[PDB]
Design a protein around this nucleic acid. Structure first.
Lengths: 62, 153, 83, 23, 141, 136
RNA sequence: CAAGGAUAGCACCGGUGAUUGGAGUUAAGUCGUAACAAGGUACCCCUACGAGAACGUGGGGGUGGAUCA
RNA sequence: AUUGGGCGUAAAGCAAGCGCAGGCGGAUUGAAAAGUCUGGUGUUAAAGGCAGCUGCUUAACAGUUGUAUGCAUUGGAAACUAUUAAUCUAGAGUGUGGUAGGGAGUUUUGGAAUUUCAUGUGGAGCGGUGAAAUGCGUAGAUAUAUGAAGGAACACCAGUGGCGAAGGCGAAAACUUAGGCCAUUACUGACGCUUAGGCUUGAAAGUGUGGGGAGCAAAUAGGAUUAGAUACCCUAGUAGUCCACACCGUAAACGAUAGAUACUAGCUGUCGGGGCGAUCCCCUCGGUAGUGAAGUUAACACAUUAAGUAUCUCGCCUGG
RNA sequence: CAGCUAGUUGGUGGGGUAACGGCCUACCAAGGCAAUGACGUGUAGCUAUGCUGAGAAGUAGAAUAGCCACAAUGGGACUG
């Protein structure tokens, strides 16, 4: 299966897991990368950084 | 994985002096379990093209359902404007088809079938159209489950 | 000069009917007369000649229907230009 | 306004999950 | 369900039904609209009864004269629509009438045929059982 | 296009068409009409049996014969068998079919019929190109 | 009852014809590569005429033209 | 092609529109049952089509019964093809409010600019392609500047265009004004659409009549590259080109895409309407276009205007 | 192939073959078939059925047989 950060100019009939995450707006993509890391981190029984915070690190790209 | 060939296309591309002969082949792969896969490729000589087509065809194998093992509903398949019509043959009338059509039908595990190839006789689109016609048929179970009415009649 | 509203309020069948088959055919006939004056003044108006043919034969169709469906619906409509 | 109603129909939520599970 | 806008009448209503359904399944739409006839409401109801399409709502504005119907297309849990492409049989200029002795079974006992024999819409099995034949209206399987 | 448009145009399969319209007529006298009697065979007389330069797809001295059938039309045929007994007035029997390597020639001859001898003890043809009995 | 009759200018069908038109196939053409590349000149087409002939220009239509923004 | 296609590029959409016949066409109730269906009666002779059976050495072949390959009649249902009545419009179209466009034809005016005519001047050239040449020219040509007559069409405005039945329309204006567009709830109330028949137009050429030939130019005359060359080009010049009655009623009539109905993204970009705001960047629905989803096609490529979706109809292609 | 048709078409009296009746005759007459394809035009007896294909249908009306015409061609009449 495929997991992708679909954009409005893309097509949603191509990815097995369509997620409306913008790359132009970094607030979505950074969060999703961190949480995808954290999923397998907690799956491997190690301390987890994010996915429990109301507002995680503001990694806004200039 | 029989990887049976159906037709080789004699082709040649013109270049700077002479003509490069890279004749294409088309093969059909099956393992007597209903598996079907078609693959077209090309190379300088027969063995390399055959091997490439075999790899391309075996990369995707498909099995089709058998119930009343003919094409139990009349349907015509067209792939690049090639008419191949299959209609239900009763299980006691004997199989009457064309050689390529017979190969496609028997490789899928079916029985006697009322076939008719029309117009052009180029085997590449003949095989493509026959594959499209045979593979686009739906199972009785398909409609039996997709429709709210469970009874298939 | 098309006689847009004047011809429509004349042949009304009901209290409020601005599209009555009677008023449609009256508008068609008025436009046919106007476009016939047009054609005699302008013999090389091809577009208007086509439009006039369309209007006159649509009037013929409407009259055919009005005779087909209801007698009274064309009992008050016997003013179609003829002779 | 409506006059008849019969056979309510619903489907799964519009997020595709391939095979639904891979455990 | 108030329309808030009236749909425009087709040349023929059954072809309107076909066009609307096919363009809805083509454009990934779930709701279809059509005119409302006793024949057409009957055919929509009998299509629903055989698990082909979802809820139908008959919409009357101020009289039976202006009546339409909006029906949802069935969508199985596998996201496969039960409408495999509706077709009309009572075609204008191709009106095909089959007697009781010529009532067929759709693709060898897989589909459903809509037959108004002598009193109303009847499915294929009851039409064979009722020993009465008549007009065949539409094919949905 | 719709059913009526497909009705306005005739919809009927005729047959596989051929290019031999000179193989149908065999008439009687005392009646100016052509009689159709499903004749399995027709005869004719070849008059101009000579050699001309044939058409391009085959380069040889392809010999041809201008035959008149029992019909009115006169057509050109290809000589049957290695060596012909078609002696410019021979009343023989004529086949059908078309050859595509001679100019003006798209017919054949039933060789052996009452006035012709060709290719006896042949490996390929002995009756369609009429000849005496060979062995295997 | 009724066979056939023939009338004067008239009415139809089939075929041939002194001379042979056009057509397509022909060991084998010269006139040109006109046109297909922008075909060494843009084309072709409706129409008028030239030209043995490609084709041409006149008005009109587009690209059945192009490297190229 | 009814079992079994296309009409943009294949044999491949009248040239297009209008529209009678025909072909088909929103809903309503109930009826006639006109048809559809229903069930019955008679009957379709024998071999036989199919089928039960019988035999001749089996078979070939012959015979018997029925089913029947058809037709006449019969009582029903009103769901279905068509009709009946009216209100509903929702396509036919119509009204009110607005509305873009070089639509068309007819009419009115104008001169930038050339030629003739007027003023002149001036010296040796002008005319022009591939190099030049034909030709004009010392009597004054070319040039030089405007002005009256003349007639052509009207630099930019000119739109990833508008309008327009395709055809076609660009100085401006007027008359008739066709149709495009929405706000179109409202409105007779299925009236409808195609449409062989028929009617009309279909560019332009050319041409009968009356004009100018000012300008152009077929034909024409010459020079010139081709082996000639009529073909590239240049120069001039008759009809004609330009106008009106017009005719030929033909096209590369092209979107090479027949119309009408219902629906189908997004986006790219030109335009119209209503709505509400400064205009673009706002929404809705449409006209003319495209990439492109689904869809379609032989692929190229259509794709909201289909070659789609389905319908209706007409015409055509069933090889050159 | 856009119209065909002056006992053709209708009625009254009479005669009439196998019968009432335009079947025909005297009267009066202008009606009658057709654009949805009338008429003429070439082939073809029609049918059960020989046969072919799977179907649409086609083929011939032949073996075998049912009904009209046919008797050198056109007629006329004989008995019946």
């Amino acid at each position: 299966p495929v997991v992708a950060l679909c954009n409005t100019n893309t097509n949603p009939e191509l990815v097995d897991f369509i997620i409306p995450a913008n790359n132009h707006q970094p607030q979505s993509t950074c969060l999703l990368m961190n949480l995808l890391a954290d999923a397998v981190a907690e799956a491997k029984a190690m301390p987890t950084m994010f996915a429990y915070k109301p507002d995680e690190e503001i990694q806004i790209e200039i | 994985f029989e990887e049976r060939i159906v037709k080789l296309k004699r082709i040649s591309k013109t270049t700077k002096g002479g003509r490069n002969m890279r004749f294409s082949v088309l093969v059909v792969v099956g393992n007597r379990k209903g598996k079907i896969g078609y693959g077209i490729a090309k190379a300088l000589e027969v063995p390399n093209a055959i091997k490439k087509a075999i790899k391309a065809a075996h990369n995707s194998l498909h099995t089709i359902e058998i119930h009343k093992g003919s094409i139990y509903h009349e349907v015509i398949g067209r792939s690049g404007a090639s008419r191949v019509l299959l209609k239900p043959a009763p299980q006691g009338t004997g199989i009457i088809a064309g050689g390529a059509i017979r190969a496609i039908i028997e490789l899928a595990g079916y029985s006697d079938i009322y076939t008719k190839n029309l117009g052009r006789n180029t085997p590449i689109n003949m095989i493509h159209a026959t594959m499209d016609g045979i593979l686009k048929q739906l199972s009785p179970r398909r409609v039996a489950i997709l429709r709210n009415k469970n009874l298939n009649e | 000069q098309i006689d847009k509203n004047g011809i429509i309020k004349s042949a009304q069948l009901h209290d409020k009917d601005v599209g009555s088959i009677q008023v449609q055919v009256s508008l068609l006939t008025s436009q046919i007369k106007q476009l016939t004056d047009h054609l005699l003044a302008n013999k090389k108006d091809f577009i208007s000649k086509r439009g006039l043919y369309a209007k006159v034969s649509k009037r013929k169709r409407l009259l055919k229907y009005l005779k087909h469906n209801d007698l009274e619906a064309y009992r008050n409509l016997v003013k179609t230009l003829n002779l | 306004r409506t006059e008849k109603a019969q056979k309510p129909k619903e489907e799964l939520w519009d997020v595709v999950q391939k095979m639904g599970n891979f455990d | 369900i108030t329309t808030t806008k009236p749909i425009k009448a087709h040349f023929d209503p059954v072809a309107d039904l076909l066009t609307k359904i096919n363009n809805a399944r083509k454009a990934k739409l779930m709701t279809v609209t059509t005119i409302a006839s006793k024949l057409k409401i009957a055919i929509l109801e009998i299509l629903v009864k055989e698990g082909y399409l979802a809820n139908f709502q008959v919409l009357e504005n101020k009289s039976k004269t202006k009546r339409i119907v909006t029906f949802n297309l069935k969508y199985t849990q596998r996201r496969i629509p039960s409408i495999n492409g509706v077709k009309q049989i009572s075609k204008p200029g191709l009106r095909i009438y089959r007697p009781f002795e010529k009532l067929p079974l759709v693709l060898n006992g897989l589909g459903i045929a809509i037959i108004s024999t002598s009193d109303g819409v009847m499915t294929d099995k009851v039409a064979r059982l009722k020993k009465i034949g008549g007009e065949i209206l539409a094919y949905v399987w | 296009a719709t059913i009526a448009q497909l009705i306005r145009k005739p919809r009927k399969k005729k047959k596989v068409k051929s290019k031999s319209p000179a193989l149908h007529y065999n008439l009687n006298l005392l009646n100016k009409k052509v009689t159709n009697v499903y004749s399995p065979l027709k005869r004719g007389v070849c008059t101009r049996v000579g050699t001309m330069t044939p058409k391009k797809p085959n380069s040889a001295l392809r010999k041809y014969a201008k035959v008149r059938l029992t019909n009115g039309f006169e057509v050109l045929t290809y000589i049957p068998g290695e060596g012909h007994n078609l002696q410019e007035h021979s009343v023989t029997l004529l086949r059908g079919g078309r050859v595509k390597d001679l100019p003006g020639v798209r017919y054949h001859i039933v060789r052996g019929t009452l006035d012709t001898v060709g290719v006896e003890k042949r490996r390929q043809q002995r009756s369609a190109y009429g000849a005496k009995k060979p062995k295997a």
